[PDB]
Design a protein around this ligand. Structure first.
Ligand SMILES: Nc1ncnc2c1ncn2[C@@H]1O[C@H](COP(=O)(O)OP(=O)(O)OP(=O)(O)O)[C@@H](O)[C@H]1O
Ligand SMILES: Nc1ncnc2c1ncn2[C@@H]1O[C@H](COP(=O)(O)OP(=O)(O)OP(=O)(O)O)[C@@H](O)[C@H]1O
Ligand SMILES: [Mg+2]
Ligand SMILES: [Mg+2]
Ligand SMILES: [Mn+2]
Ligand SMILES: [Mn+2]
Ligand SMILES: [Mn+2]
Ligand SMILES: [Mn+2]
Lengths: 453, 476, 459, 493
DNA sequence: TTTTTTTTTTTTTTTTTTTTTT
DNA sequence: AAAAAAAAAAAAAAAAAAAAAA
């Protein structure tokens, strides 16, 4: 199965734009310890950028790149590079270049061409694709996991860790991509962008209707008055200029009315039927999507529950589950056979633990072909008991998922007590320390395991 | 027990005391230290020449104040005495105690009166840690009550130096290897890394004894110490790090040495290995004859009963309910609370204390339940089981296992398909179902961005065209 | 300077609705510890509800009350009582009653009448207010601080702790009511709400005007055709039914056209002129408001500047500052906190770590509860050391110790700290200020309880 | 010093060793246990009969493995010896050591060879705090290397049982009180809750020495324990918890005893208190004459230079810039670095090393600078200074504390409604709405909560002034928007 | 040089809960 | 009981804009 080997950050965020910081990942555990502002989260941001191609949240102004105003130069060029082996066993490397060219007034951010190569056993360097559009699709395809799993479950951001307990629309949007049902959700959003414009048009047609009706009134009356004047003239012949005037008015002003108007009416009718059909299909093609969501959610709930049972060290909540049925999409908690929505009715530590459990349960049902998961500060707002139980549970997960091909747990923390219960020294002989140098750039070291306290 | 023969070296063997385990527990909080005091008192009044401790004297790498103070209390009340020990150290201790300036055994120190020298190695829990790489046994060695031996300065080139004793005419070589990581220890043993300097002078009458603290058998590929990587010149191996007690000696055929596994004194985990009765062993080395061994059971181990059941193996239990599973589990825990209380009372009334019924100390009870669904029934939901922390909180006051009396474990149409079956229902009045399901199918699979707008716009224009050619449609 | 003394919870969140747990807040330090799901934050939620009178965020199902779905009773009532002392040394008590009926599957939430008594030195109980709406204005006035200070600064919720690093509009909203300038913002919202209506009217007017134009295009033509037919008849008299028909059409269809249309047009013009006049004053009543936000927040930046320097243990950021400048189209206001990394100014939001944005938030709240909270010396820190490393935990503890020493030479000062971690307790020198700490626990029936324990019992 | 008189009891007094301060610091990580070892060596070969420690032997509540190891190695090497201790015990030890089954002094133990007993009370740092209330000295008492005395069980009632010693013809009474919170022992002393068990025989012959570890002076009203609560029969007081080494015996005129403030062995906080020369003292009790003190300086204490300046006093320092003051602070720190190095070299080449040159230990440097704004200018911005840690990282390789060389400190409704809006009001300049009615239309709105006060004001204008303009027929004939504005402005004037 | 696309930010609809009036 | 506005807080949706595809 797939596995990551090495990462080579350069010029990104806190890092130096004239260096090449390298961190190598080992099996089955990787430990990253540093201070505040070292660059620990930037490593995971770079991993996610290499694997999927999307920047961290709230990075509009090119803040992912090493700041030009700090360095003082103008043309900055970052480059994240990752070495990994595919699910089938092939060895591959992916490169991603970006630029932050700065003008006098504004700074322009652009993404240069990347590179993916499948290096054989004898160093047979053969490129697969170069443009970043296909680089965002080949790498998740080679790893084996969908692109959503890589950015919500495996390399989840530190500030977006608690996504399972967010608004219902956010949960539905994030489970649409995990379940590979985003295609149909975009088809619905495109069928909605056919009703929108349509509606506007209908709104125009209606106005026109009024006007047209007025014009239609102005033609039957003149034809009846002409007939009344004609039959009066016929009576006087048996015993004209009013007809001539009314006929000229009908020929100039009220000519092609009976059917021009006909077609208008037709159009209106068409619009009316176009409405109902867009809605009706949308309702049926969305009930099917939610049915698929709820059908593909049973296996996740079965391993959410077994993880919660042996990890939560408390006597209030029995189990926890995610259930679908806008989009009454939520995670509920059971307190002695009663169901209550967890959101707005829990605490900070329980929310943190629920999010960790949900991500770990999604990692082993969809990331079965990619045994990688990165936990960025797992022990926040957790008491001593839950820290110990979480460490023991992670140890059990590592043991269980090692008769598989591999399992790579990247742990980022500076809470010393969490290391003890997981036996960090029993799984690795070293760890990596991130620290600023005397010029404020970040460095990644290689420290012996016993030298941590 | 009567004094040994002047040519007989009697040693008490203990390991895996784990002093400091569950220190803050309100009930079983002193369990570990009390058992260690009993072990070190079963040596003071058993007239042992010395005792050897095969690692894990402390549960943590940095022992607390109460752990350290209660281990210094027994080491001072049981080792210090006026009767001089009869062991003469033949070797040079500086090659064995090379860490500091305290380069000799404690009983040779003029400032200390030691009647029982305690020799110990480090384990996988109380190992070297810090900037100075100080073990917890190095802080006891400074005190002068224990002598830590068998350190590993460099973990890739290991050289084991013995301690050479002799009592009259019986000699003894005490080899000791600390607890190093098994992945690296195997990698070192594989390529001529670990060496032993067997004594060269008058070889043939030594009793070669070794203390190890590695895994005997590993579940993984290469994470245990093979019992075949040792030297054939050994006569007995004292295997630590394994918590199951084996009162006998497993004679290793091809290497001609007996492996002893003393187990542990405290139960740091409630498993089937730690439900076996615990012992501490007494060797008797005598030149010319076999080393007879006497296991003396510990009388301070808290009573432990274990049962591991499977819910799918018992009938009349249906997964849908919970009120009938937690009634059978209660009846299964309550019978082995009585089974353990009966054992505790019988053992308390089997040592001369049979004329009084005291307040029995609470036992340690564990029920490991497998709440897996049976094979025949193919449903997502398995058996329903109550919260383990709250289920076992209803036995408080009757069991020393406060919060963990039961442990539950498990034994070991992609859209379109279902979307195509919905087509029949969705009955529109202008748009054809077949062209629209296929207008979206094409949109989805073939990635043709503009298809659903165009199909709608085209089918509109055809339906407008058909309605406009009927003049009767415009009069209604 | 005001001070809180004793709080009693009953029925709120995990607390039992048939019992009552109390906690006494000592000076100058209060410690609350417990496990996850104990009720530590519910204490701060109830304090904030007692003083200001607003429920915790995301509590629209009546989930601030002990849920009746697990107890099995229909009518359930909660109560929160705080015994504080006024700013000018007056012992008062506030009570807050809440009801949650569950008749059918729908649950109804209601706030019954409370009471604010002001006990004299002779136990003269005198309920001076009963309406909860009155209480929300009385209690903050008696404490001495504005209501917005007690919501975001003093008794800030745990989930809203990092509010100084939120979106610019969400930041100006918080700072608007802190500076007591929300009244003119309400006026601006009103001058915006009328505008829209007027715009709609303009639209209507326009349509009407078009119609009027059509009528004004017509009528005169008939008048010209009538005059042409009249002068032809006058010529034939010197040598009618077409005029009669056109005159009847003018009398029935095109009668009162000349004035009407014109006045409609005038109305439209008026609307246009109201658009200009409503906008001009409005873009000035905002320039005189944000000129006051950046004028009042001047001694606030002096205290963030000297708290940051003495607390942040790092080599990158020199100081932090809050800048409130006008503006791009779609950003409303440029209200954000900036950081100076070696005398270059960078916005802190989007390029700061999880620990730096926690320390900045704590420091900003501390600097706010020194200038606009000088009449009420209370500050409730809930898990201060989240994502803070060893050095920052130690320096924050030292800085809190320095604040306690400095602000207590003056009148009353209290500092509630909720935490569960050993390093902060060790570094802060907790035992040198109190002899006890309250420990929240859940009993055998899942009901939270508060216990008074020894100081030397926290291992 | 040589062998004391057989009638003399010689004591080495030390306190506040803090073995464990800056344990992990790369440079000054071994300055605590090394100087404790130097103290115990100055006790071994000065032939002192006993050493009494008066608090804070360890910096932390749970000492580490390096601190315990180094203290045990120090005690084992220079406390044990063949020479018997010549002190004779007269009291029952069980009354003083009332904690365990080790109820006798270490040097009277049949299976130890203690030649110089080390006593000692607990401090406010290494105090008893655990499940069973064990302090770090109760561990050392279990090893037999020190004898921890003066341990309080209950804070409300205190009984102080002394240790009674006799050498030759000289008797000693060692009183000891642990370190309990000052603002509670104050209450206990206040209501007669502290008692001293004086010896019953031969009043007027004992040297009553007491080791107290409380705050000597309270700068705030409630911060300390006074010397007026201590009894008058005492002959000497050894005050701990105070790091400022006063090498003289401060005589109390009314209670008739001498206070001693030894100080500390290591500087735990860089300030002026720990910038005085530090000593360990030697007492020479003998019956017949007064005791004679003898301070002996410590020679393993890192050279510490302390300067404190206020930035505003120096002229030519404009607060707006942050580089003309940085260039001044840099040169001040580099000036007082060379003074520290000169003193280090002058003290290292004056003990027997006047011919060999070695790398001097890096000094401790601390400059306190007051970046307060001058009294003349009241601008919110004071002196601008850079990051304290990055400023102190410029001296790495020349200073022991590379992160705290410099410390910065300070030596200390709605803007009248439309008051600020008034300016804008007059400059608003609209062309239909009157300014006065609108500022007052909003004042009323904001001021007297009239929710719709604004609302109607504007809508009177879309009434009153409609018709009013509808009354000028000339206004309706002009399609030019500039003539329309000129007409409206002329009707307003 | 011009057009789709994704991300933030701000603005809106719903739905209870008060508050009015009785 | 009974109803009819106001206030306000969550959840979902619509502009603005800079990057990327054309
Ligand atoms: N675009 C940028 N240019 C320069 N510096 C930046 C940029 N973005 C962030 N930084 C700085 O780099 C650091 C970011 O590192 P990061 O956020 O990964 O630290 P961290 O290890 O996550 O810290 P924490 O422990 O608080 O989570 C911050 O100190 C930030 O100020
Ligand atoms: N409306 C409610 N009814 C009944 N029980 C509730 C309700 N809301 C919350 N609870 C339970 O009571 C607990 C109280 O939460 P609280 O905020 O006190 O936890 P905490 O003390 O903050 O601990 P931590 O912050 O570590 O999670 C909740 O976590 C939840 O388990
Ligand atoms: Mg981070
Ligand atoms: Mg909380
Ligand atoms: Mn063990
Ligand atoms: Mn072991
Ligand atoms: Mn002290
Ligand atoms: Mn001190």
């Amino acid at each position: 199965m797939s596995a990551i080997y090495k990462l080579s950050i350069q010029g990104i965020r806190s890092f130096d734009s004239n260096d090449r910081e390298t961190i190598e990942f080992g099996k089955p555990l990787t430990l990253i310890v540093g201070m505040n502002g070292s660059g620990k989260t930037t490593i995971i941001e770079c991993l996610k950028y290499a694997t999927t191609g999307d920047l961290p949240p709230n990075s509009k102004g090119g803040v992912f790149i090493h700041d030009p105003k700090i360095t003082g130069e103008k043309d900055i060029r970052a480059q994240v590079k990752l070495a990994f082996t595919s699910a089938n066993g092939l060895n591959m490397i992916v490169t991603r270049n970006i630029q932050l060219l700065m003008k006098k007034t504004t700074t322009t951010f652009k993404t240069l061409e990347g590179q993916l190569v499948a290096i054989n056993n004898s160093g047979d360097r053969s490129t697969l694709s170069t443009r970043s559009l296909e680089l965002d699709a080949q790498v998740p395809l080679y790893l084996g996991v969908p692109k959503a799993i890589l950015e919500y479950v495996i390399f989840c951001h530190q500030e977006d860790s608690l996504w399972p307990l967010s608004e219902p629309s956010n949960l539905k949007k994030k489970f649409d991509e995990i379940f590979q049902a985003m295609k149909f959700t975009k088809a619905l959003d495109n069928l909605k962008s056919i009703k929108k414009d349509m509606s506007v048009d209908i709104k125009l047609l209606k106005q026109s209707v009024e006007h047209l009706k007025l014009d239609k009134d102005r033609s039957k009356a003149m034809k009846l008055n002409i007939h009344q004047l004609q039959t009066k003239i016929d009576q006087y012949n048996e015993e004209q200029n009013q007809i001539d005037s009314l006929t000229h008015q009908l020929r100039t002003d009220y000519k092609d009315i009976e059917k021009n108007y006909h077609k208008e009416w037709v159009e209106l009718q068409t619009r009316s039927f176009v409405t109902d059909d867009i809605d009706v299909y949308s309702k049926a093609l969305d009930s099917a999507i939610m049915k698929y969501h709820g059908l593909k959610m049973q296996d996740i709930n079965r391993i959410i529950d077994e993880l919660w049972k042996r990890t939560y060290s408390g006597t209030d909540i029995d189990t926890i589950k995610i259930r679908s049925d806008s989009y009454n999409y939520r995670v509920v908690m059971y307190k002695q056979d009663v169901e209550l929505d967890m959101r707005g009715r829990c605490s900070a530590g329980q929310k943190v633990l629920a999010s960790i459990i949900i991500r770990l349960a999604l990692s082993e049902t969809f990331g079965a072909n990619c045994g990688v998961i990165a936990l960025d500060q797992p022990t926040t707002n957790l008491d001593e008991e839950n820290i110990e139980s979480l460490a023991k549970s992670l140890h059990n997960i590592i043991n269980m998922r090692r008769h598989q091909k591999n399992f790579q747990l990247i742990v980022i923390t500076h809470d010393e007590k969490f290391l003890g219960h997981m036996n960090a020294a029993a799984f690795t002989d070293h760890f990596f320390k991130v620290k600023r140098d005397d010029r404020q750039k970040s460095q990644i070291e290689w420290v012996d395991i016993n030298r941590v306290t | 027990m009567d004094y040994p023969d002047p040519d007989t070296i009697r040693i008490l063997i203990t390991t895996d005391n784990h002093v400091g385990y569950n220190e803050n527990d309100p009930i079983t909080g002193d369990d570990s230290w009390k058992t260690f005091h009993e072990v070190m008192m079963l040596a003071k009044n058993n007239n042992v020449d010395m005792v050897v401790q095969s690692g894990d004297l402390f549960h943590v790498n940095k022992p607390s104040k109460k752990s350290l103070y209660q281990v210094l209390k027994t080491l001072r009340l049981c080792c210090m005495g006026d009767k001089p020990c009869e062991l003469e150290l033949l070797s040079d201790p500086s090659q064995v105690f090379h860490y500091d300036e305290f380069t000799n055994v404690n009983y040779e120190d003029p400032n200390f009166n030691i009647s029982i020298p305690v020799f110990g190695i480090s384990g996988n829990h109380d190992d070297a840690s810090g900037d100075s790489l100080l073990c917890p046994m190095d802080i006891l060695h400074a005190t002068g009550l224990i002598n830590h031996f068998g350190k590993v300065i460099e973990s890739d080139k290991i050289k084991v130096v013995p301690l050479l004793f002799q009592k009259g005419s019986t000699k003894l070589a005490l080899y000791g290897l600390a607890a190093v990581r098994d992945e690296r220890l195997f990698r070192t043993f594989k390529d001529g890394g670990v060496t032993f300097e067997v004594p060269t002078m008058r070889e043939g009458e030594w009793f070669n004894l070794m203390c190890v603290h590695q895994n005997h058998t590993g579940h993984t590929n290469t994470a245990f110490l093979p019992e075949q990587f040792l030297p054939d010149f050994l006569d007995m191996v004292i295997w630590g790090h394994e918590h199951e007690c084996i009162p006998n000696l497993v004679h290793n055929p091809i290497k001609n040495f007996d492996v002893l596994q003393p187990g542990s004194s405290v139960a740091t985990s409630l498993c089937e290995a730690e439900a076996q009765p615990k012992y501490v062993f007494i060797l008797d080395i005598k030149y010319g004859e076999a080393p007879k061994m006497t296991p003396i059971p510990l009388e301070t181990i808290r009573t432990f009963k274990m049962k591991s059941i499977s819910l799918q193996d018992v009938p009349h239990l249906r997964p849908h309910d919970k009120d009938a599973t937690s009634k059978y589990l209660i009846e299964q825990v309550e019978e082995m609370i009585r089974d353990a209380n009966e054992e505790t009372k019988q053992k308390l009334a089997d040592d001369g204390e049979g004329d009084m019924v005291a307040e029995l100390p609470k036992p340690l009870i564990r029920l490991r339940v497998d709440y897996s669904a049976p094979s025949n029934t193919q449903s997502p939901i398995d058996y329903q089981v109550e919260n383990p922390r709250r289920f076992s909180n209803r036995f408080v006051g009757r069991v020393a296992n406060g919060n963990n009396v039961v442990q539950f474990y498990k034994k070991r149409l992609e859209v379109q398909t279902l979307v195509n079956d919905l087509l029949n229902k969705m009955q529109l009045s202008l748009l054809p179902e077949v062209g629209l399901n296929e207008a979206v199918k094409k949109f989805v699979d073939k990635d043709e961005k503009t298809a659903l707008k165009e199909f709608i716009s085209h089918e509109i224009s055809n339906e407008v065209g058909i309605l406009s050619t009927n003049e009767e449609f415009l009069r209604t």
